[PDB]
Design a protein around this motif. Structure first.
Motif, PDB file in Angstrom:
ATOM      1  N   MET A 172     -15.967  57.664  77.562  1.00 34.41           N
ATOM      2  CA  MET A 172     -16.123  57.916  78.991  1.00 34.41           C
ATOM      3  C   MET A 172     -17.208  58.951  79.261  1.00 34.41           C
ATOM      4  O   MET A 172     -17.899  58.859  80.280  1.00 34.41           O
ATOM      5  CB  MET A 172     -14.791  58.332  79.616  1.00 34.41           C
ATOM      6  CG  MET A 172     -13.754  57.205  79.679  1.00 34.41           C
ATOM      7  SD  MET A 172     -14.355  55.605  80.282  1.00 34.41           S
ATOM      8  CE  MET A 172     -14.993  56.053  81.910  1.00 34.41           C
ATOM      9  N   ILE A 230     -20.223  58.207  81.787  1.00 38.36           N
ATOM     10  CA  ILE A 230     -20.582  58.968  82.970  1.00 38.36           C
ATOM     11  C   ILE A 230     -22.007  59.492  82.846  1.00 38.36           C
ATOM     12  O   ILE A 230     -22.758  59.519  83.830  1.00 38.36           O
ATOM     13  CB  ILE A 230     -19.567  60.093  83.228  1.00 38.36           C
ATOM     14  CG1 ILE A 230     -19.797  60.673  84.628  1.00 38.36           C
ATOM     15  CG2 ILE A 230     -19.693  61.210  82.205  1.00 38.36           C
ATOM     16  CD1 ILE A 230     -19.723  59.637  85.736  1.00 38.36           C
ATOM     17  N   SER A 231     -22.420  59.871  81.633  1.00 36.80           N
ATOM     18  CA  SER A 231     -23.797  60.328  81.442  1.00 36.80           C
ATOM     19  C   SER A 231     -24.798  59.195  81.644  1.00 36.80           C
ATOM     20  O   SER A 231     -25.882  59.408  82.198  1.00 36.80           O
ATOM     21  CB  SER A 231     -23.967  60.944  80.050  1.00 36.80           C
ATOM     22  OG  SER A 231     -23.005  61.958  79.840  1.00 36.80           O
ATOM     23  N   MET A 264     -25.137  58.618  85.416  1.00 36.82           N
ATOM     24  CA  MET A 264     -25.844  59.697  86.101  1.00 36.82           C
ATOM     25  C   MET A 264     -27.359  59.641  85.899  1.00 36.82           C
ATOM     26  O   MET A 264     -28.120  60.151  86.719  1.00 36.82           O
ATOM     27  CB  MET A 264     -25.307  61.057  85.649  1.00 36.82           C
ATOM     28  CG  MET A 264     -23.820  61.249  85.891  1.00 36.82           C
ATOM     29  SD  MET A 264     -23.472  62.136  87.422  1.00 36.82           S
ATOM     30  CE  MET A 264     -24.477  61.214  88.583  1.00 36.82           C
ATOM     31  N   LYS A 265     -27.788  59.021  84.804  1.00 38.62           N
ATOM     32  CA  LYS A 265     -29.207  58.934  84.476  1.00 38.62           C
ATOM     33  C   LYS A 265     -29.852  57.627  84.934  1.00 38.62           C
ATOM     34  O   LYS A 265     -31.060  57.452  84.748  1.00 38.62           O
ATOM     35  CB  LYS A 265     -29.402  59.143  82.971  1.00 38.62           C
ATOM     36  CG  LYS A 265     -29.163  60.613  82.565  1.00 38.62           C
ATOM     37  CD  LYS A 265     -29.052  60.841  81.054  1.00 38.62           C
ATOM     38  CE  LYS A 265     -30.368  60.577  80.318  1.00 38.62           C
ATOM     39  NZ  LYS A 265     -31.505  61.392  80.834  1.00 38.62           N
ATOM     40  N   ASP A 266     -29.079  56.707  85.528  1.00 38.69           N
ATOM     41  CA  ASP A 266     -29.621  55.476  86.121  1.00 38.69           C
ATOM     42  C   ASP A 266     -30.278  54.580  85.074  1.00 38.69           C
ATOM     43  O   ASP A 266     -31.344  54.009  85.306  1.00 38.69           O
ATOM     44  CB  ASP A 266     -30.624  55.792  87.245  1.00 38.69           C
ATOM     45  CG  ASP A 266     -30.014  56.607  88.398  1.00 38.69           C
ATOM     46  OD1 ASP A 266     -28.798  56.496  88.694  1.00 38.69           O
ATOM     47  OD2 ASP A 266     -30.768  57.359  89.037  1.00 38.69           O
ATOM     48  N   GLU A 314      -9.920  53.521  84.236  1.00 39.15           N
ATOM     49  CA  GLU A 314     -11.221  54.177  84.110  1.00 39.15           C
ATOM     50  C   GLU A 314     -12.287  53.389  84.848  1.00 39.15           C
ATOM     51  O   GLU A 314     -13.126  53.972  85.544  1.00 39.15           O
ATOM     52  CB  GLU A 314     -11.609  54.354  82.636  1.00 39.15           C
ATOM     53  CG  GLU A 314     -10.691  55.306  81.853  1.00 39.15           C
ATOM     54  CD  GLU A 314     -10.860  56.754  82.283  1.00 39.15           C
ATOM     55  OE1 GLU A 314     -11.674  57.019  83.199  1.00 39.15           O
ATOM     56  OE2 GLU A 314     -10.190  57.635  81.706  1.00 39.15           O
ATOM     57  N   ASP A 331     -11.801  54.207  88.567  1.00 42.63           N
ATOM     58  CA  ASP A 331     -12.241  55.550  88.920  1.00 42.63           C
ATOM     59  C   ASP A 331     -13.771  55.596  89.040  1.00 42.63           C
ATOM     60  O   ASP A 331     -14.311  56.139  90.014  1.00 42.63           O
ATOM     61  CB  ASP A 331     -11.704  56.562  87.886  1.00 42.63           C
ATOM     62  CG  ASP A 331     -11.492  57.986  88.467  1.00 42.63           C
ATOM     63  OD1 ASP A 331     -11.772  58.236  89.662  1.00 42.63           O
ATOM     64  OD2 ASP A 331     -11.064  58.878  87.700  1.00 42.63           O
ATOM     65  N   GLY A 389     -16.734  55.804  92.722  1.00 39.59           N
ATOM     66  CA  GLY A 389     -17.902  56.634  92.940  1.00 39.59           C
ATOM     67  C   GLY A 389     -19.214  55.892  93.148  1.00 39.59           C
ATOM     68  O   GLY A 389     -20.266  56.538  93.186  1.00 39.59           O
ATOM     69  N   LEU A 410     -23.977  56.532  93.144  1.00 45.79           N
ATOM     70  CA  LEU A 410     -24.654  56.070  91.943  1.00 45.79           C
ATOM     71  C   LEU A 410     -25.676  55.002  92.312  1.00 45.79           C
ATOM     72  O   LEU A 410     -25.785  54.587  93.470  1.00 45.79           O
ATOM     73  CB  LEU A 410     -23.645  55.520  90.931  1.00 45.79           C
ATOM     74  CG  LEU A 410     -22.602  56.502  90.390  1.00 45.79           C
ATOM     75  CD1 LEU A 410     -21.591  55.740  89.545  1.00 45.79           C
ATOM     76  CD2 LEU A 410     -23.272  57.661  89.562  1.00 45.79           C
ATOM     77  N   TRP A 446     -18.290  66.222  76.128  1.00 45.83           N
ATOM     78  CA  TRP A 446     -19.460  66.325  77.000  1.00 45.83           C
ATOM     79  C   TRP A 446     -20.769  66.275  76.212  1.00 45.83           C
ATOM     80  O   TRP A 446     -21.679  65.501  76.549  1.00 45.83           O
ATOM     81  CB  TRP A 446     -19.357  67.606  77.818  1.00 45.83           C
ATOM     82  CG  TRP A 446     -18.050  67.686  78.582  1.00 45.83           C
ATOM     83  CD1 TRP A 446     -17.094  68.665  78.483  1.00 45.83           C
ATOM     84  CD2 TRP A 446     -17.557  66.740  79.548  1.00 45.83           C
ATOM     85  NE1 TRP A 446     -16.048  68.396  79.339  1.00 45.83           N
ATOM     86  CE2 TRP A 446     -16.299  67.220  80.000  1.00 45.83           C
ATOM     87  CE3 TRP A 446     -18.055  65.545  80.079  1.00 45.83           C
ATOM     88  CZ2 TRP A 446     -15.529  66.539  80.957  1.00 45.83           C
ATOM     89  CZ3 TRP A 446     -17.286  64.868  81.040  1.00 45.83           C
ATOM     90  CH2 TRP A 446     -16.037  65.372  81.470  1.00 45.83           C
ATOM     91  N   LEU A 481     -23.817  63.447  76.474  1.00 40.49           N
ATOM     92  CA  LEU A 481     -25.200  63.678  76.878  1.00 40.49           C
ATOM     93  C   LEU A 481     -26.160  63.242  75.779  1.00 40.49           C
ATOM     94  O   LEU A 481     -27.186  62.608  76.056  1.00 40.49           O
ATOM     95  CB  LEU A 481     -25.400  65.161  77.231  1.00 40.49           C
ATOM     96  CG  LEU A 481     -24.687  65.590  78.527  1.00 40.49           C
ATOM     97  CD1 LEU A 481     -24.475  67.074  78.555  1.00 40.49           C
ATOM     98  CD2 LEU A 481     -25.442  65.142  79.776  1.00 40.49           C
TER      99      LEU A 481
END
Lengths: 331, 327, 328, 327
Positions: free
Chosen positions: B28, B32-33, B36-38, B56, B59, B63, B67, B245, B249
């Protein structure tokens, strides 16, 4: 050390003087979702984390720090002591007791009051000029609690309110139409959660209201049953909690959207929870979500949505319920 | 229909799709990373636990307003992964107390004999990125089962180890890690090799200024920086129970290079037979050029004899386990 | 409208992340668009002496607001519009004319800066100054002298674009993204800059360790031509399109990013190097500098060969020989 | 190759390539906006003046360090454009003083008879985005020369007009333009149509609060906002001699919806025969759903009788000229 001084000559003794700092209070799943989203949008030059569990707190801090190569936020700090939060522009509250099965909102809030009586005076001491953003549930009542304890003017105490409810509405509207949520408009206002109000008159794509084409929009007579979109919004958190046990990602993105408008002084309009005494017929000190202009001084203006008698009555009932709970609170 | 008039009977073919396999904390965080970076126009999630998977997925979808990834889908059925450019594997077995290495690796082989062939079947052209630990041998396992050419099977390897090194390096120097250069190579984890000769700021080698850099004679004990790197996952797990995390990334950074064909150089795990004296099919981290076809080129790092021996040893350890595996 | 929006707060907005660009020629507008698309500022101010052009540029940027995250774009010939800038970028100046000596050209820039810089300092006493006007290194000295600012807060763009060009050409030769190709061009921006061959590397592997003649005339890969191309770059582009804009704009915004977000990244930019690198005069030269919210706080000390040393000293002598003739 | 060891014989082909045709001030503003939004893995520039072309290319390449678009190429030969997902046409001719409107369009036809067939030869599957003015008739021209289906030929249309309207609306209200909604439709330029019924903040229609909105009896005189929208280019041209930055950002916004398959709604120029009482092949701006297949759907705006008549009058003028062009 000596090697550093062979490599680098220092020409300036500098001070801390944090410039674009954000504090997140609480490193549960919501708080860390807010934290990662804020980091990946480059909103802060310093991020502070606070919580009372010191192992958890420090390990989350370290996990984030290890990704620094891939971020543009040079300072990530944490401590159970609130001096770590000094000089925040924005302090995000996600801590508090989580609701037990069968527990009333009055009992839960009262359980949180002793928590907030520690956190809020500490936040206010070290960042007397910050904006306060309350995310902890039940959001509308805890924003009131934080406002009363802080002594802050109303423009600087903000509840995340219905920002995510409206985002969820637009996601579901977009899935139905085959259009991106960015181009699908609709506002869920009032109390966050079960009593929220879908403002059917405002639901539109490219300035074409759906109600103008479907006069029964949102009623029981509606042949497309758009009332079930709002029901899905109301039931979203319960549904996700049932599958995975909690929600995190969407509220974190929602909260970072609000952080962006504050940190960048955008003056965008958000469905968020503000002290609306004097508006929409409300006569007591109550926080509900209306469309708010959000910028560097918090909430400076509100849009006046034209509500039907039914919508206005739903709003007043929420405010009466809210006030009924608040005046039973022991501060 | 009265509001929107359709003009095109079109069918949607995913152009820049990414799949994540496994929705534990690692998967996950990658998800999510990446969002966030498209990097993707479609994200697919797969896991055996159907309720946790669906929750998941939901969720994340909630959002979508915030995005630019217009389609997020999930299923335990691998058909939902069809036409992925990139497939990221985070699933696997965790070591049982008293279980031996090989036996743990063999259980991972059995798991991957289901996962990898299903991936290959619906995305015959994807790049495979293996994050599951132990990463170097599991990349080999994925390579063997998939049948893919070696350029398209990648292990995250020491990418995060090096980013941690550059973080700790930046703390000692007061410099942003983007400007602190250093490379941890070899076998991800306890046997990895920090290449002291390449540690530098602005092209100024730190060893040239401290000839004992990294040795036991080092007046500043910079070897403690590499020890901190080796202990990092352990310290974080002890404190918060797992790591999420930083690996997320780090994997998004690799995904960016692949999806955008950037040809940046990363310390990742590739099949190095023929180089650094290695004679068997083994995967270790070296500096790799990463792009739309995976790993197309490697940087030849000049290694001291001690460093070269360490790479050779861990290659021997890997091949010893690998030749006992039952595929 | 009062019926639509109800005001709840009487507020006096103070910009918190304001940037000013002085000069709206091609270089200034390239800095401006890059800064806007990197979301670095909450307010952008433009200043120039040509009133019409200035207002047309401001309007054109404002019409793109919908696609930006910078909520206020203003402009004026009056420097009051620049009040409370964190960062002020100077691109304006004089251009040499036929029959005009270099000294007279620089003196015209001094007299221009004697109007601009005191006005900048009046309205933003705490700003960092980033000088882009050519000749860059001399004019950073001019701005520093006139401003009375401490040296950490007067920055010349220097060899930032030169090093970026070197890294572009290096990556083209190797088939590697320039982000992973390292090399440093230092000293004087333009003709007399110095390529530090000892530092050219990929993944910490020094090319000179593999090729001992790297950068010399005996080098069989002729890497010296990469630096020659760096030196000739502006000239080729100016010959072909009349001026340069996009690259310098992107490199200035890279500097702006380190400053506004306090990144403490290392950049080859021009700083007051007196007492460092064997230099004895108040001169600005490019060395690897740590760039953050207080400007240049630290300098990396590159080990230089005797040849590299002599070239930096010679540039210092050349710059000082001009600067001592100037009338402030 | 002492430093880098090649491991793969790759014949690399571009996956997310964009072409910009014309490197005047509009085209270069489109280019820099697209480079800074990380929309493409390869950018190609084409124009007939070779020195100008090569210099713009070099200036962009010299910033590669600060970008994530790893290949930037140019030529006057259209082979440099092969395999483009999206081709943006900004080239053409400007109306000379005393020149008839019909003569100007025809000169642009002649130029497009060279450009469009070359684009189509090297990128037969691209989407075409026409920016050259006058946009509405030149989107038709490109559609007819290309042979493309209508979904793949898009005119930038009223996208910037509506963005200027929202800027000016936001300035009047003290609100960011992202939260100020309004739609300018029809023919780009003097004849565009502001749809007063859709102007709103937070779903609150301004007309519901002010029934005279946009009429001469409007006490707040919102009609002057649309006049400012119409006069904007003329004003900016008068001050700086041309416009560039805003149209560049507007085009990059459309490119984003295409490249990322966002299916956002934009007021852009599309073949609208069969809608709004229009029976000829004309392109006008209506709210379109824009994605990886171009324009796939259209929003049906309820237009008042006056508004329907403005749109039909533009259609008649457009067809009148188009009827007379020599292809």
């Amino acid at each position: 050390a000596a090697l550093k001084d062979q490599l680098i000559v220092n020409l300036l003794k500098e001070e801390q003087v944090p410039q674009n700092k954000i504090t997140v209070v609480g490193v549960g799943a919501v708080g860390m979702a807010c934290a990662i989203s804020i980091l990946m949008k480059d909103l802060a030059d310093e991020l502070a984390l606070v919580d009372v569990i010191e192992d958890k707190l420090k390990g989350e801090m370290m996990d984030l720090q290890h990704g620094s190569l891939f971020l543009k936020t040079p300072k990530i700090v944490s401590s159970k002591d609130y001096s770590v939060t000094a000089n925040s522009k924005l302090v995000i509250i996600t801590a508090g007791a989580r609701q037990q099965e069968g527990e009333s909102r009055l009992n839960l809030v009262q359980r949180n009051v002793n928590i907030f009586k520690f956190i809020i005076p500490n936040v206010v001491k070290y960042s007397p000029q910050c904006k306060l953003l309350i995310v902890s549930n039940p959001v509308d009542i805890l924003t009131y609690v934080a406002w009363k304890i802080s002594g802050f003017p109303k423009n600087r105490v903000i509840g995340s309110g219905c920002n995510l409810d409206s985002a969820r509405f637009r996601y579901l509207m977009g899935e139905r139409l085959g259009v991106h949520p960015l181009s699908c408009h609709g506002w869920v206002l009032g109390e966050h959660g079960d009593s929220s109000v879908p403002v059917w008159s405002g639901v539109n794509v490219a300035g074409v209201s759906l109600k103008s084409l479907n006069p029964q929009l949102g009623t029981d007579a509606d042949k497309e049953q758009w009332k079930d979109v709002h029901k899905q919004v109301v039931d979203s958190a319960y549904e996700v909690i049932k599958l995975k046990g909690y929600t995190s990602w969407a509220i974190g993105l929602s909260v970072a959207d609000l952080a962006e408008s504050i940190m960048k002084n955008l003056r965008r309009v958000h469905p968020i929870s503000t002290m609306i005494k004097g508006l929409y017929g409300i006569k007591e000190d109550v926080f509900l979500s209306v469309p708010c202009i959000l910028g560097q001084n918090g909430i400076s203006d509100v849009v006046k949505v034209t509500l039907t008698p039914d919508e206005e009555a739903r709003l007043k009932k929420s405010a009466d319920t809210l006030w009924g709970i608040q005046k039973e609170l022991q501060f």
